[PDB]
């Protein structure tokens, strides 16, 4: 049995840790909702 517990408000925070890159990926989405790479 699953249950939910509150974790916080949904707000944009100024001066948050800025990280992560922006890759352009060729992908395919199957009927089971799974993404895969196309190369």
């Amino acid at each position: 049995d699953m249950y939910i517990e509150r974790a916080g408000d949904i707000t944009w925070e100024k001066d948050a840790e800025v990280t992560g890159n922006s890759p352009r990926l060729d992908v395919a989405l199957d009927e089971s909702g799974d993404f895969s790479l196309v190369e």
Binding site: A7, G8, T11, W12, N21, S22, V27, G33
Partner: protein, 156 residues
């Protein structure tokens, strides 16, 4: 039980101890999460019960108590915030510039941040704080890291 707007952890006591399997958004009395988190099962909120209302395996989304309410979209230009809620850890905003998933049916925004599978369902926000999608469904790149789509439902 608790129906206040906000971000919530999805827990289970079926495995060892209490394990976090995902995350979700409460907005306008509707709980929104990814399909793979609950597999469409009922949820508990204190003494109250949340029943599935809409869901789709291919979109990997599910709504509880009512129809999908989130309809903000990534503008294709600006940085966004992943409001990451990792297992056993505090909610934390991470700002990033999204990449692109190119598909045969159009392009989708993608966030390149690596978090545990139990973080699935964490909302991605725009500068106004509106939920533009959920984090948790994507691909494992050549490195081994995860790159998630910005998955958004449709507001009927």
């Amino acid at each position: 039980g608790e129906t206040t707007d906000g971000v919530y952890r999805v827990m289970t006591r079926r495995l060892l101890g209490s394990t976090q399997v995902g995350v979700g958004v409460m907005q306008e009395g509707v709980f929104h999460t990814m399909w793979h988190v609950t597999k469409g099962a009922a949820l508990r909120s204190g003494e109250g019960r949340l029943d599935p209302y809409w869901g789709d395996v291919k979109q990997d989304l599910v709504s509880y108590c009512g129809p999908w309410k989130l309809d903000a979209a990534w503008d294709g230009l600006s940085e966004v915030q992943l409001l990451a809620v990792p297992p056993g850890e505090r909610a934390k905003n991470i700002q990033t510039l999204p990449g692109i998933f190119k598909t045969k049916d159009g392009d989708i925004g993608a966030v390149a941040l690596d978090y545990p599978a139990g973080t699935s369902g964490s909302p991605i926000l725009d500068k106004c704080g509106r939920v533009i999608g959920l984090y948790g469904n994507g691909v494992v790149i050549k490195n081994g890291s995860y790159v998630s789509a910005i998955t958004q439902g449709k507001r009927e």
